[model samples]
Target: MGHHHHHHSHMAGPSNVPAFLTKLWTLVSDPDTDALICWSPSGNSFHVFDQGQFAKEVLPKYFKHNNMASFVRQLNMYGFRKVVHIEQGGLVKPERDDTEFQHPCFLRGQEQLLENIKRKVTSVS
Candidate 1:
């Protein structure tokens, strides 16, 4: 038999990944990619945004929504569908509770990108 290939035309988002194995497969499969990847403080959570979201333009807004989950949903409403928001209740930060009503903490995984806001603002001045 010939090798069968499946085509995925859509992006992932809060609405997708209804199964454990599929999502786990996604994670186990791409452990070497260089783009934005996340891991919870306790080793119980992991998430990965798509290549598009890693572009410089979306970085700011990405973190904004990442800090909270309603924001991630809001981003989904807009168009970013690759948000694989993950949650390990035992490891989620309490400060991130603002999003508990909507989705669990995906941002709780991994250290956020370093920001130099003052440098950006002052350098331009």
Candidate 2:
């Protein structure tokens, strides 16, 4: 027996993930790695998203979906994954439902401020 090496041609995803979330591991693992890494308000939830979406782009859309599950599935179609929180951080394994999408309350307030067109916009009647 010499050196036995197993070569994986088309790599799928992370292997040693929590067994419950294995279906999600494939999409979260590799191919492209420009991820959106973010933490929730209390820093309790952390997440990662691939290039298709980001904190700057997706937060407002949460209200469009009926529930968290629907939102998550939509993001999944757009390459959304998440980082499992471990304070003593190292290689954060990206997974599904490791975090929840917290709607940024500030966005609504900002919308309210801007939509108040009397201040910022000059309406020439």
Candidate 3:
């Protein structure tokens, strides 16, 4: 069985950011595990899942402070999606966000995730 959760904090503007993100933040934050392109003002970049999630959650805290539109757009462009969802929400039709639209990278009959997990497991074995 597999399960996942995510959250992102909308920026007040495009460039806002906090000097640091604390443990308190993690308690209330969720992040997209799979993101495509992420850039930093510092010229550092990575595709790490937790980093993507953390960076997004911190955007509002640091810069732009409340840019919801930018947040949604960034998420839309990054193409985050959920492969496994259990309690699919009500029939009320939540806004069509990326989560509701991502095709299963697994269901496509590929072994990317499986292969990565295998590599990790085998490394530890």
Candidate 4:
């Protein structure tokens, strides 16, 4: 027999965050995390998740202001993916089309999401 109960206790609490949030928190904290070049609903600017003080500083600020939900929604809309735990030392790079997708590790992905615009005109139109 093993200490299986001890492991189960970690996730048995009501306050425990869902597994997805747990993974995002882990990735946002990575020193070498990547970037997500896109626009945010709250701010019409580039939204990058690159390893910075955001996890240690900015995120806490939003959490304190009860604005974390907006950020979480942005993450979901951008396509944040679930990460799996495996043996370290591997080069899993994103695909070219992944630039339009949202990921935990903010790689060099770029995509413009104009959520605030409507009835926009195009050069060809």
TM-score against truth, every candidate: 0.22, 0.23, 0.22, 0.22
lDDT of 1 at 124: 21
For model 3, how does the per-residue alpha-carbon lDDT over 1-125 read when each residue is reduced to its tens digit? Answer: 32222321331222122212121123223243223222222312122223344345544554354444454343243343333222336756433332222322212222232121111222220
Model 3 TM-score, 2 decimals? 0.22
Counting clashing residue pairs in each candidate, in order, gives: 1, 0, 14, 3
**Best by the lDDT measure:** 4
Worst 10 residues of 2 by lDDT: 116-125
Deviating ranges (above 4 Å) for candidate 2: 1-62, 86-125
Question: How well does candidate 4 score on lDDT at residue 21?
Answer: 36
Ranking by lDDT: 4, 2, 1, 3
Q: In model 3, how large is the Cα lDDT of residue 6? A: 33
Candidate 2 residues 54-110, lDDT tens each?
433443332332244554654343333444443433556543323543322212113
Clashes of 3: 14
**Alpha-carbon error at 34 in model 4, in Å?**
8.9
lDDT of 4: 0.35
- lDDT of each residue in 1-125, candidate 1, tens digit only: 52333432342322333232233224323444323444445433444454344333233332332233443443343233343244537775432211111123232232211011011222220
Which residue window of length 10 is worst by lDDT in model 4?
116-125
